[PDB]
């Protein structure tokens, strides 16, 4: 089951 | 009362 990292998901936003 | 999120603050320092 996918474990969601709340940080990597936010980081992509800054660098698209 | 403002709750301070560390990651969001630093997400700015690296941006600028």
Q: Which two tokens stand for residue A3?
A: 């474990």
| Contact: A10, B7; criterion CB under 8 Å | yes
> How many CA within 13 A on the CB side of residue A7?
5
- Burial status of residue B11 (CB atoms within 10 A of its CB: 0-12, 13-18, 19 or more): middle
Method: cryo-EM
SS3 of residue B1 by DSSP = coil
Question: Distance (Å, rounded) from C-alpha A12 to C-alpha B1?
Answer: 29
User: Which regions of A1-16 does DSSP assign to beta strands (E)?
Assistant: none
Establish how many alpha carbons lie within 13 A of residue A11's alpha carbon, considering only the half-sphere containing its beta carbon.
Answer: 7
Question: What distance in Å separates residue B4's CA from the closest CA in chain A?
Answer: 16
Q: For residue A1, give how far its alpha carbon lies from the nearest alpha carbon of chain B (Å).
A: 26
Resolution in A: 3.0
């Amino acid at each position: 089951n996918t474990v969601y990292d709340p940080l990597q998901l936010e980081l992509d936003s800054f660098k698209e």
